Write a protein that binds this DNA or RNA. Sequence first.
RNA 1: UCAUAGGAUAUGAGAAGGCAGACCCGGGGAACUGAAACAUCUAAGUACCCGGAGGAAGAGAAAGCAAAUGCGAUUCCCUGAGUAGCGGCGAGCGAAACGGGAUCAGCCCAAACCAAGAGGCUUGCCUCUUGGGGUUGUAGGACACUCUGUAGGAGUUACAAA
RNA 2: GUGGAUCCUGAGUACGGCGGAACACGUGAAAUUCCGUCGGAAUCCGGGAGGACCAUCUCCCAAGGCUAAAUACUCCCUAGU
RNA 3: AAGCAGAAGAUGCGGAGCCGCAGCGAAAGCGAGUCUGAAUAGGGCGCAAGUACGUGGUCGUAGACCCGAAACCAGGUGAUCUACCCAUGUCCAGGGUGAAGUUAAUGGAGGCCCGAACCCACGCACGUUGAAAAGUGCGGGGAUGAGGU
RNA 4: CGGGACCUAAGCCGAGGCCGAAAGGCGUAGGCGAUGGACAACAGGUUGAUAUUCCUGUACCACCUCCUCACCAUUUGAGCA
RNA 5: AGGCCCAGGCGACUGUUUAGCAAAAACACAGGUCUCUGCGAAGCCGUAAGGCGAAGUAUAGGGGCUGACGCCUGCCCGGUGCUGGAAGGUUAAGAGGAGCGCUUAGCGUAAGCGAAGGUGCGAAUUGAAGCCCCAGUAAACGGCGGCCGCGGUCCUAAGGUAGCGAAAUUCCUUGUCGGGUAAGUUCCGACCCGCACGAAAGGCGCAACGAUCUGGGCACUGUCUCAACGAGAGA
RNA 6: GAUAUUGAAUGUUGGUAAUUGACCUUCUAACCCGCCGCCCUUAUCGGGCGGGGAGACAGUGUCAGGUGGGCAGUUUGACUGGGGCGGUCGCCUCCUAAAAGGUAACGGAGGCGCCCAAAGGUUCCCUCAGAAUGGUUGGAAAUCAUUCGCAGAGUGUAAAGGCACAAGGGAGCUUGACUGCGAGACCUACAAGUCGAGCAGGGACGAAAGUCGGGCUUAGUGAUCCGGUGGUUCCGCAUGGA
RNA 7: GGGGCCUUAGCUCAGGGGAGAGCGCCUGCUCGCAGGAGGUCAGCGGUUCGAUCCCGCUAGGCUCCACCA
Length: 249
Amino acid sequence: SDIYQHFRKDERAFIDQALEWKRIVQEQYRMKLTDFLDPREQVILSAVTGQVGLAFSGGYDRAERKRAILFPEYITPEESDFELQAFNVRYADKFVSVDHRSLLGALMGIGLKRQKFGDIVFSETAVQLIVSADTADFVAAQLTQAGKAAVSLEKIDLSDLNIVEIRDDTVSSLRLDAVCASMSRQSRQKSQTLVKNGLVKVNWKVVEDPSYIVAEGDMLSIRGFGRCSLTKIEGKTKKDKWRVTFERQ
RNA sequence: UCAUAGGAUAUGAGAAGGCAGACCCGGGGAACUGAAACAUCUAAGUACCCGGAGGAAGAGAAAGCAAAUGCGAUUCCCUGAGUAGCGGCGAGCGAAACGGGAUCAGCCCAAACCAAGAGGCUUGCCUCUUGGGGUUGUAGGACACUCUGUAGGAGUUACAAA
RNA sequence: GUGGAUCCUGAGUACGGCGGAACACGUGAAAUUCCGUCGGAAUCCGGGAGGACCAUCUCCCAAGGCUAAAUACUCCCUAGU
RNA sequence: AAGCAGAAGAUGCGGAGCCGCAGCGAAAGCGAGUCUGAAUAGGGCGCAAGUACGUGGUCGUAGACCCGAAACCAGGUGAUCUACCCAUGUCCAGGGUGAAGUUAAUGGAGGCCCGAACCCACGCACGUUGAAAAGUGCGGGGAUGAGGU
RNA sequence: CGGGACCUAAGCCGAGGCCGAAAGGCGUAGGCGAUGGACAACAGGUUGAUAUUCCUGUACCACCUCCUCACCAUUUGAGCA
RNA sequence: AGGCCCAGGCGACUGUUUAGCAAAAACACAGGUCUCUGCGAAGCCGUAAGGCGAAGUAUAGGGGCUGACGCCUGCCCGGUGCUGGAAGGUUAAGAGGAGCGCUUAGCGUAAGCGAAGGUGCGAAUUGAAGCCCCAGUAAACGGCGGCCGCGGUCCUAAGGUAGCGAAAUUCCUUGUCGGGUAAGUUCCGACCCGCACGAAAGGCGCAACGAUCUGGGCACUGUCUCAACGAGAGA
RNA sequence: GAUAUUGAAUGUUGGUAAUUGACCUUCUAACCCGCCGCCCUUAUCGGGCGGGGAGACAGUGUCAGGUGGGCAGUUUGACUGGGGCGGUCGCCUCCUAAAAGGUAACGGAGGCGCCCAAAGGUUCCCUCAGAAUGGUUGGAAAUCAUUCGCAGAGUGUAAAGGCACAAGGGAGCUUGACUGCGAGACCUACAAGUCGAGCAGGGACGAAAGUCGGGCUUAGUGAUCCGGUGGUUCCGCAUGGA
RNA sequence: GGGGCCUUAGCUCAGGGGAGAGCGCCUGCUCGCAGGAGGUCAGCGGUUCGAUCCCGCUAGGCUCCACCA
Ligand SMILES: [K+]
Ligand SMILES: [K+]
Ligand SMILES: [K+]
Ligand SMILES: [K+]
Ligand SMILES: [K+]
Ligand SMILES: [K+]
Ligand SMILES: [K+]
Ligand SMILES: [K+]
Ligand SMILES: [K+]
Ligand SMILES: [K+]
Ligand SMILES: [K+]
Ligand SMILES: [K+]
Ligand SMILES: [K+]
Ligand SMILES: [Mg+2]
Ligand SMILES: [Mg+2]
Ligand SMILES: [Mg+2]
Ligand SMILES: [Mg+2]
Ligand SMILES: [Mg+2]
Ligand SMILES: [Mg+2]
Ligand SMILES: [Mg+2]
Ligand SMILES: [Mg+2]
Ligand SMILES: [Mg+2]
Ligand SMILES: [Mg+2]
Ligand SMILES: [Mg+2]
Ligand SMILES: [Mg+2]
Ligand SMILES: [Mg+2]
Ligand SMILES: [Mg+2]
Ligand SMILES: [Mg+2]
Ligand SMILES: [Mg+2]
Ligand SMILES: [Mg+2]
Ligand SMILES: [Mg+2]
Ligand SMILES: [Mg+2]
Ligand SMILES: [Mg+2]
Ligand SMILES: [Mg+2]
Ligand SMILES: [Mg+2]
Ligand SMILES: [Mg+2]
Ligand SMILES: [Mg+2]
Ligand SMILES: [Mg+2]
Ligand SMILES: [Mg+2]
Ligand SMILES: [Mg+2]
Ligand SMILES: [Mg+2]
Ligand SMILES: [Mg+2]
Ligand SMILES: [Mg+2]
Ligand SMILES: [Mg+2]
Ligand SMILES: [Mg+2]
Ligand SMILES: [Mg+2]
Ligand SMILES: [Mg+2]
Ligand SMILES: [Mg+2]
Ligand SMILES: [Mg+2]
Ligand SMILES: [Mg+2]
Ligand SMILES: [Mg+2]
Ligand SMILES: [Mg+2]
Ligand SMILES: [Mg+2]
Ligand SMILES: [Mg+2]
Ligand SMILES: [Mg+2]
């Protein structure tokens, strides 16, 4: 009842379902695996669950979309309890490239919901994808094309997963509109339009307040400029102005 | 309901209030001031208020002082000594014992136990009330022993009281 | 006076924690004394003190009571300086 | 010294105690030396007339040469003045206006109007060792009210 | 006549009682307390000085019974209350 | 036994106030609004008992602000307050004793080791409100921009809406123009470069009301030109 | 919030070997009732008795944390061409300063609150700035070479006084940037501050003489109280320890 | 008048070792792109081998004071 105030109105939908997962694990005494929750939904679930203990894993370490196990004070989980299947994406790499957009578009095109897959890993040697095991055979059978590339999926173990733009700058304040204008290299009035409309995020939360103060180590996501991180804040310079370090993806 | 609360009556040289503007013992307790300011601290447990007294009060017969081939209740005086110490180690506060004097005095219980009676029988146990018994420290007492006294000694200032 | 078979010798006490006060002694190395609060002994093969504390030794026997004198003071009365 | 005896005296007794005769060192301690230091060195401090009483000067603690605050604190005394309240009384000449309601009339509302008593205190003058430690005179405001007493 | 031997208001006091280092604070029963309620005397005269107070005349109120008269009644029995 | 009139500021009004230099534009007020308060109410007095609140009960009671009436009351919740609250962080006494010191029966040629007890400290762990933190809230405390050419740009929590404006606010200032006068630093009406108005510390109006403040008229006069004489009180 | 007053059960979850904790719910009997009936009793007080409500909570005590101008005691510097505001406050150097020393003003100029393990000690050796003339890059200015050249440089750093038998530059070896001190001086109200030959211990460099107790000199610092750490033939409240 | 803070390209801004972003503007381009322009670093003298940077002055502008009589 008195949790919704701290989150967004749209985020209420997830919080209701997050409470329903906590309802199970307390009363019934069993682990509840979730369908790959978004980076934001990881933060929300962490709060809603409370301290029912919580574990999270999206296959490899540093996955955006991860599946969450809600377990009690016993039955500490394993890697395979998350029910993750990795695949190597096979294609005629010498003749066609697969990009992240094409592969993401193809996964969505076969009707796969965003919650049924984790990260899409691009290395120098491999293109790999992580899905929920319950959808593995469907994805392997249906994902036959990504963009212009004919593709096939080879099952691999999670152990076989083949897992910056440093920009020292100054800003007058640590407000969202100020930091965005500096990062994106725009006028502030234009940057305020990005925030107010609801295009900027801060750690995957849609911040619509221009005056929101940005902390050290916050993933900002300007729809237009992509994604970027305030990594270091190193005090004020001469004539005020915070020293800051930006790192675009 | 038994009761008890309450009510009534009788007997009380029972209390009450005052003051000597003093002294004494308690309850409560300032501030100015000093510290060259000020808060700890000081002034001060003072002034003041309150309670209780008594001709005095308080203290008093070692769970003491001490560190000797010791002392032997308390109180007060001299001295120790403005020492030891305490202290925004500042301002200041400040002993005690030993030693020398005044004065001198020591006692009664509680308990064990005994006897008698009473009311709870908890049913030969327990609790209570009288009288006896008993009074302390290199322990004493009960308890047992054998002694011994029951009228010389003591006394209304404690040690019973007219 | 002699004996140590048993029994008795002051309990919500002593003491301790916490908070205060009193001790010349301001929380200090702080004994000692008292108050509130809470906790809480041993009981003679026992207990206390000797300025934290322990051991040894020494001195003592608390948690009941009474007790003159030496001391203080003078509204008064008498005599006097 | 207290104390005892003695005129409230002198004085006698009283040697506990006090200061001095030895210092040096934080101290154990050593001693005409001692401390520092490894040191027979060097250096520091010492070595090589006090005391009891009296008068006087000054100082300390006391109000401390005298007079003087504004203040602070403690315990009392005051609401016979005044502020507000409570209970109970009482006062307010006269005139005017004319709400509601009722059937133009009737009716008689009001922190209503004019205006004495009464209450107040706006202006000016006078008074200013006053008639008066706040008034008087001429005007002024309220005057059935949140009224006066 | 005004006040008391009548009544109560505000308030005040307050047996027991409640509360509080002490002193005390509060308060019930019960009282006290007019500025209010109740309550029988008037006119005239008089002194240097009092007058519903004295005097004259004419009244009224409460209470009393040595008495008088009438009426009612002695346990469903007057009457008082 | 009323002087009257025109126009403006302030306050709606009758009231109230600095006994004894201020009666006013100050206070109050009806009305508005916010907020607290479920009754042993909140609030208040008292150490308490006992009370007021109230012999009341949310159409009631307390507190804050505003101040008839009319039209209205904009933007900002970053800060502070108030209300509520999820994760995460922090935090007392008390609880809890892992360890350690001192002591010494014993043990050791000594040096030193050292049981048990006593005693002196004591770490982890546990530990509320609160705070950090999050959300809301402006008739809560408050705040309502610069610079450059309606646009840009910087900055902010957000940059002053309506209305008003040289004002009880305007320094410059006797602003400027008009009115009124022979002549008007005052007054009235506009203007707006508001030094430094502005919406319940309300904004703007506003009939009635005022021993209010302000400007102008009629009437009237020894106030004056400019004094004279007379009466009385004192001299 | 803990703890006392403060009890009984049922669950559940700790920690010790079946007792004791933690928390949840329930109970009634403490505690509470500004609720009703009855009695004391003519009584809206109080008390008793019986219902009811609530209940080991509350209240109250002790202890603890938070909040707390509601209230209390206080502090809130001095200099100063009046005070406020501004500036300043200690140390070093120069000038004022009148040829010893000292000397004031909110007089005139600047520095300091360090730095260096060599930028210290010693032994040995050395001479700088700049210019002229010549030079592939290369220039006014890098690097040579020549001559001239009291210093026109350098000296960690402000300034003054010094310094070329160098106190300036280079190299080797070192730690005297020593311990105990100290005749005697300077300065000085005191507290402090400064210089010091020389003696002893044990060293460094040097063949030796000798020099060395930091630095060319003069700033680079802060009393006491209190507390920490290391050392210690000291004390240790009966004695041994602590 | 006294303190304080500023003055970088046309504009806004980076910063003891030699002045850069982005914008404007310019180029040629199929309305975003490639590349260029633009600097007494407000003025000055001096500390330094070097100064936009330290240091002291000097304009100009912004902010706050200019009070007691
Ligand atoms: K004081
Ligand atoms: K003083
Ligand atoms: K103590
Ligand atoms: K205790
Ligand atoms: K003893
Ligand atoms: K000597
Ligand atoms: K002599
Ligand atoms: K003398
Ligand atoms: K004197
Ligand atoms: K007023
Ligand atoms: K005029
Ligand atoms: K002057
Ligand atoms: K050398
Ligand atoms: Mg003083
Ligand atoms: Mg007596
Ligand atoms: Mg007597
Ligand atoms: Mg006695
Ligand atoms: Mg007797
Ligand atoms: Mg005894
Ligand atoms: Mg001892
Ligand atoms: Mg006071
Ligand atoms: Mg009185
Ligand atoms: Mg009175
Ligand atoms: Mg009227
Ligand atoms: Mg009168
Ligand atoms: Mg008046
Ligand atoms: Mg009138
Ligand atoms: Mg009468
Ligand atoms: Mg009373
Ligand atoms: Mg009584
Ligand atoms: Mg009367
Ligand atoms: Mg009558
Ligand atoms: Mg007469
Ligand atoms: Mg008015
Ligand atoms: Mg007045
Ligand atoms: Mg007046
Ligand atoms: Mg109450
Ligand atoms: Mg009441
Ligand atoms: Mg107002
Ligand atoms: Mg508003
Ligand atoms: Mg907020
Ligand atoms: Mg005129
Ligand atoms: Mg205003
Ligand atoms: Mg407002
Ligand atoms: Mg107004
Ligand atoms: Mg009026
Ligand atoms: Mg104050
Ligand atoms: Mg004082
Ligand atoms: Mg001064
Ligand atoms: Mg001056
Ligand atoms: Mg100043
Ligand atoms: Mg000279
Ligand atoms: Mg000279
Ligand atoms: Mg001190
Ligand atoms: Mg000892």
